[PDB]
Amino acid sequence: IGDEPLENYLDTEYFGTIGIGTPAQDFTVIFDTGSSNLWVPSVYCSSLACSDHNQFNPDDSSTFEATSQELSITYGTGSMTGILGYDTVQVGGISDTNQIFGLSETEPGSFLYYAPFDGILGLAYPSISASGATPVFDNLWDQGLVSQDLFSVYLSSNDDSGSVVLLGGIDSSYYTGSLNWVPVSVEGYWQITLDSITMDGETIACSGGCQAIVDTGTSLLTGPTSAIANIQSDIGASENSDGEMVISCSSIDSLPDIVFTIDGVQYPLSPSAYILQDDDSCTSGFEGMDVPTSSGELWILGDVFIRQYYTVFDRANNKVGLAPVA
């Protein structure tokens, strides 16, 4: 098993330290179930983000092997380009020998300047990996570095230390009751069929089944702008001058749970999960966004669902298991 602890930063990002090379150079990265590529800032990046973050130096760690394969990758927050390479990556206790990863060359857009992490570690299927680069987990299994072809995620609420990604094992005590093994839909993202979304006695959003991705690399619960406008006035949100989706925190004291039924089992999301009380006010945790070019209208069950549910992503059995935490 590998134990990779994660820093919870303002309940909006969750990242961990991995070390690349021998001797280990040190990097912060998100562990993202919505991408499959690992990259680095390298020393050949002159972008603003790159003056701001730890940069890998190929020259100084003795096990790297260079490649002439390039890596361009577009995401929702912006884009980056780099070159691939092989080095040992120390992750959660395991020395993943000869892992291919990206050394970035450019990283535009100020998102990545302000972002507290250096790079990205993707945990979804190799299908979505640009350049066909072998994703970390896949490379741990191909080497037998793990006993079980599954990894489990724990994500803390309230800014407490303790979120972890158990590489190759499940920690039974992190959840109450039993796991419920839901099947995947398309093998690329951790995509599953959502049967409905109900407020109180009546369905408000998936009246015919919707498709959802289970995604640690996003803070909010997102669905399409249509269904979402519909949830926003239901919970009582309004537009603020700035653009914020404002709600009164009193609503936590008076609003009922929303229920997402995934493959038979009803999973509730309480108001203290989907309405955030921040240093500013209370805003909704539902965000409008429309799905990217190569896929059909995705719902993203982000950090606001994961925090409340122990999730296991079983590669061996192509299933996701879910259980109420604690």
Swiss-Prot record:
One of its GO terms (cellular component) is extracellular region. It is found in: Secreted. GO terms for biological process: digestion; proteolysis. The active site is at D32, D215. The keyword Iron does not apply. The modification Phosphoserine is found at S68. Residues 14-323 form the Peptidase A1 domain. GO terms for molecular function: aspartic-type endopeptidase activity. Changing D32A: Loss of activity. Keywords: Aspartyl protease, Digestion, Disulfide bond, Hydrolase, Phosphoprotein, Protease, Secreted, Signal, Zymogen. Minor amounts of the active enzyme occur with 'Ala-58' at the amino end. Its main location: secreted. This is Pepsin A. The lineage of its organism: Eukaryota, Metazoa, Chordata, Craniata, Vertebrata.
